[PDB]
Amino acid sequence: AFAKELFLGKIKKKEVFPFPEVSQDELNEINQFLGPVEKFFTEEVDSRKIDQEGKIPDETLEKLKSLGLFGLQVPEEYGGLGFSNTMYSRLGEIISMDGSITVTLAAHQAIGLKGIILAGTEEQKAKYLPKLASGEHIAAFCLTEPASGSDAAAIRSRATLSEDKKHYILNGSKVWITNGGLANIFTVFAKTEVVDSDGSVKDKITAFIVERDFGGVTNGKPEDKLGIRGSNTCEVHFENTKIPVENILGEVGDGFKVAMNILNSGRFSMGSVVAGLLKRLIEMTAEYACTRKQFNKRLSEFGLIQEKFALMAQKAYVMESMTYLTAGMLDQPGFPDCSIEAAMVKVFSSEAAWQCVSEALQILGGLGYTRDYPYERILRDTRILLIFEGTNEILRMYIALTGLQHAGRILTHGVVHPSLADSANKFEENTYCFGRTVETLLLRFGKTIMEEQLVLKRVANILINLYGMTAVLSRASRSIRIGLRNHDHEVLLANTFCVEAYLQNLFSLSQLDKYAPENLDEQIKKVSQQILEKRAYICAHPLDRTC
Amino acid sequence: AFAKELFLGKIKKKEVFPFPEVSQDELNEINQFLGPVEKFFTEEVDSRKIDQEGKIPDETLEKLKSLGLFGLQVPEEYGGLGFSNTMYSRLGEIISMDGSITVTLAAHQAIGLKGIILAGTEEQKAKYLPKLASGEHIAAFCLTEPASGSDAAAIRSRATLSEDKKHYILNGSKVWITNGGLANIFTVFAKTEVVDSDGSVKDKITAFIVERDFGGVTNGKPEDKLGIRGSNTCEVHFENTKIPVENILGEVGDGFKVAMNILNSGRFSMGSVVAGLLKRLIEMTAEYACTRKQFNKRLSEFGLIQEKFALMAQKAYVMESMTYLTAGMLDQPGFPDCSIEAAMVKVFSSEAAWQCVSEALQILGGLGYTRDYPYERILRDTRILLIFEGTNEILRMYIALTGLQHAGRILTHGVVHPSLADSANKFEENTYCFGRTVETLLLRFGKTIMEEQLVLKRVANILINLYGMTAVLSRASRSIRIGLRNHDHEVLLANTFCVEAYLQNLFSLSQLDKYAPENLDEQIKKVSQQILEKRAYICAHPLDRTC
Ligand SMILES: Cc1cc2nc3c(=O)[nH]c(=O)nc-3n(C[C@H](O)[C@H](O)[C@H](O)COP(=O)(O)OP(=O)(O)OC[C@H]3O[C@@H](n4cnc5c(N)ncnc54)[C@H](O)[C@@H]3O)c2cc1C
Numbered sequence A, B: 001a002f003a004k005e006l007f008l009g010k011i012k013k014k015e016v017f018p019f020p021e022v023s024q025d026e027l028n029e030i031n032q033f034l035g036p037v038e039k040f041f042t043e044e045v046d047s048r049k050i051d052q053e054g055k056i057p058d059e060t061l062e063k064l065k066s067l068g069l070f071g072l073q074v075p076e077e078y079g080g081l082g083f084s085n086t087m088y089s090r091l092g093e094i095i096s097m098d099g100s101i102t103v104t105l106a107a108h109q110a111i112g113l114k115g116i117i118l119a120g121t122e123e124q125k126a127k128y129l130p131k132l133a134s135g136e137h138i139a140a141f142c143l144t145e146p147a148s149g150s151d152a153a154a155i156r157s158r159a160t161l162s163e164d165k166k167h168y169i170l171n172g173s174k175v176w177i178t179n180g181g182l183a184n185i186f187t188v189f190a191k192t193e194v195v196d197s198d199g200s201v202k203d204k205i206t207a208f209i210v211e212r213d214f215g216g217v218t219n220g221k222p223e224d225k226l227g228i229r230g231s232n233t234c235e236v237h238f239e240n241t242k243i244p245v246e247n248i249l250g251e252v253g254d255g256f257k258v259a260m261n262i263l264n265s266g267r268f269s270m271g272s273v274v275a276g277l278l279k280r281l282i283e284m285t286a287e288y289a290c291t292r293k294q295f296n297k298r299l300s301e302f303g304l305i306q307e308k309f310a311l312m313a314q315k316a317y318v319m320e321s322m323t324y325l326t327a328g329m330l331d332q333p334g335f336p337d338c339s340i341e342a343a344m345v346k347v348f349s350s351e352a353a354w355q356c357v358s359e360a361l362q363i364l365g366g367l368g369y370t371r372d373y374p375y376e377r378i379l380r381d382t383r384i385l386l387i388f389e390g391t392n393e394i395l396r397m398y399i400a401l402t403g404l405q406h407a408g409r410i411l412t413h414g415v416v417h418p419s420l421a422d423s424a425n426k427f428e429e430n431t432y433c434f435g436r437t438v439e440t441l442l443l444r445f446g447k448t449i450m451e452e453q454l455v456l457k458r459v460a461n462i463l464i465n466l467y468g469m470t471a472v473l474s475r476a477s478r479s480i481r482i483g484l485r486n487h488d489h490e491v492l493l494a495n496t497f498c499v500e501a502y503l504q505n506l507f508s509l510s511q512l513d514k515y516a517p518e519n520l521d522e523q524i525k526k527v528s529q530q531i532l533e534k535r536a537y538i539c540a541h542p543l544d545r546t547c
């Protein structure tokens, strides 16, 4: 991957900078495909009715099955469409208009049946995948226990062999699974004892493809969510579940690798989702500011709405750069390992989504707060993307933790257009200084870097900014060389983000020094310790007096 | 006030560093009153049922009337409680828990009947205030029309003087008037022709105390609000309203000044309302931060949760400093024009509220997004504070130019405790250079500063941070000298805020120079104007290519 090489202080030239280019025929045929898709979301989708009622209408879901979006990444031989990673991102740019169905389909494709394709047996593939991609079967990714979440190694669901050793018995419950109410196939992750030459009785996690027809799998009442009322998040209890031995992934005991790959192979497309959302915002607020008058003038002439529009456009553009570069590096021959960059795209998309949606509702003022306008649904559904597919704080570790281990093992520019000359120099300076800082950080902490949960956050921020800046440089250089329309606008959108990210990175890199007077790590530690040991607020009220 | 002297480069040390101190008898009286108030709010209020149903129950509102809480800033002779400013903030900290009720009370007290006390006559006061503060009459502040929330100098409500000289006739419609559904007294603001010696027929803004019993005033259907569903925000229509000639504030032709003075006196309370929220959150999450297991450890042992808790505590402490210093400035003899400070505290409180509520729901992760937990209600209700009593976006103009206009006319440190030495050494610096910058602006921009609103926003940020830093310095110095419990915790919070605000203000001041390459005023302007002319996102997809 490109991210893993950032820590060593080297930038892989002749790579990333040539932006992924798609030939004409795929683009033409996918416009022919998106015709009906865009039409169907525009006419037949009643977003307000779905959000208010909280139940997806049967006709809409049936038509969605008919268009076959359930198998976008499924290979053609198994009834899928075989769209590449880039094409999935392009279709996800427009799939996000509803807001509720996007989560259901991300659960069905990105994570749900991803396990069968990644590590399932060929017989299991032929048995299940053609029916899953057709839409009759829906996959739900059951991983979390009521007292679980991150660090799923500690699951309390027991699966054990039977006397005849011909079928497994499973008993457990799962709490937060998207589309668990209607799903007919679950990728349950449970625990089972394993025996080896040492005679050990260690317990290891294993996967299980479980149907609702096996019996003993029961569903509870759907949980009344805040924003995406369309999704059907439920409770599943497995009591006395009988599983034939053929329903297992890889080999018994290797559940951690499958779980990690499933989580790490489906977070880049989300980055495009937000981008599409932001487009809709600038398709609805821009107009309003034109039909509303203040200071005897239209709203658009004020500089303080102009800066908000520029910020929204900058976030959308940088987000598109991230998503499409990441989806273009996954289409190379083989199986490249670019799980970090999907995390970068996910984190940046969530942050920019929250900031820009808050600002957009602010521009509409008091009018946007009511439900007559649809800005409620956008704000409520934008929140979940920070929670969805793992929290941002975990991915802040994953970007730093996994990359630094690769960095630790090793220790133990005429490509951009002349118009963007300053951005290349700033990117080179940031990469060099950041490499030196990471080298010093690994030298000083050594192996104790795990507990420095604050340092990893700053390193993750710097890495996300560097990846954003380099993706934007690559996209702008392509747009200039091809001579695409409005190339000066995209040059300005590149330079603004380059200056902003350079300032932020220079701030973050400065406070990662041994003798930095601005290093505010101990103060936060002490204060947080005080509140956490008291478990309430500390400071007494100003009114009270004690001589 | 203290803020107006900041731009000249001089610190009003006598006014703000000796922190306001309440006498023992007054403190005993206020605790005696909060006793029953805290009991009633804790045991009787059913926040979830009010939020879900959207209608305030009759019994709880009647009990609130029995407590006589609708009037507390009312003078004691007019049935009021005669509470001072600091007592209002302290009782706001308590009433902040419900969320729906605080909006109704702010509409009744801070804005609604504030006009009668500020500019009403003795006869009008004796006629209306005793019934208003009793609870059987509620005042609603009608200022906005379908197309006029800001710049009220452009209202289209027509009030004309009848030929008999004894009645005014009023016709108009108002939108987004808090508690307009049940209010029986309106401070309607309209326009009426005025005749002078010059023979002009110009229209001037006038106020009108209007009763529902007059006739021709109709209530529309309540707006279906997003979060604060308890408060009844409705539509009020004035069709042929007859107004007796004695219901005018001040004199005919001074409605704009009365409106401005009403608005500029009720924005410090919600500086501490958020405190009465955030402290509760720092408790409500803290329990959850110790009753869940991850990585085999309590979440409180992680760095990120520690950082979030310290941030929440810091914001709560700074808002306490701002609100109580501002409430102590007002209680001095006379009524100094502290219009800047109230707006400043409001905007800082709103920003910190949004940030901290986002972080707090993030800590609870997937459980917080559920409607069962009360974190959903807090997130939905915290939105209004970026809108209510006018948006915080325009309140960044009063803070920006009300001092510059004051500074324009003029141009045409042993009090702090030694422990907080270096922080004070920063504060003076963060003022001194700042003053120079301001005066340089008054040269370079001449009188054109109004239109270049980005500079105004930057100056607003610098001033807000300076006031926050000086307020926390003064409060921490008082707490050290008196010897309150956990004073070292207060010192740590004060030092953290001083360093953070100094960094942010140095960044803001560094980019206000002409020869600073950190300036983005021109590029943002160009990008925003391009987008606004295009009416939508102008940049195209990267998949599309041109031969
Ligand atoms: C729950 C609620 C409570 C309310 N309470 C009150 C109340 O107590 N009193 C009251 O008077 N109104 C109140 N309002 C009305 C509110 O202030 C809005 O003005 C109203 O909803 C309609 O105004 P608008 O959308 O036309 O505002 P606009 O000003 O048209 O909104 C456009 C946005 O552009 C920006 N902007 C506007 N003018 C300027 C400028 N000159 N310079 C720079 N930026 C600018 C601001 O961000 C503004 O929000 C309330 C509204 C709601 C929803």
Ligand SMILES: Cc1cc2nc3c(=O)[nH]c(=O)nc-3n(C[C@H](O)[C@H](O)[C@H](O)COP(=O)(O)OP(=O)(O)OC[C@H]3O[C@@H](n4cnc5c(N)ncnc54)[C@H](O)[C@@H]3O)c2cc1C
Pocket (backbone or CB within 6 Å): A111, A141, A143, A144, A148, A149, A150, A176, A177, A178, A384, A387, A388, A389, A390, A391, A392, A393, A394, A397, A453, B294, B295, B299, B302, B303, B304, B305, B362, B363, B364, B365, B366, B367, B369
């Ligand atoms: C809509 C939705 C969709 C979901 N989809 C899935 C899914 O596809 N797959 C799945 O497995 N689960 C999924 N979940 C479950 C979710 O990931 C968690 O299991 C759930 O929030 C349970 O609470 P928690 O363990 O995250 O508690 P939390 O306290 O929220 O745990 C995560 C948070 O705790 C802190 N934290 C945790 N670990 C660390 C650490 N090592 N270092 C620092 N801080 C840390 C951080 O603040 C982090 O944000 C979903 C949940 C929801 C609501």
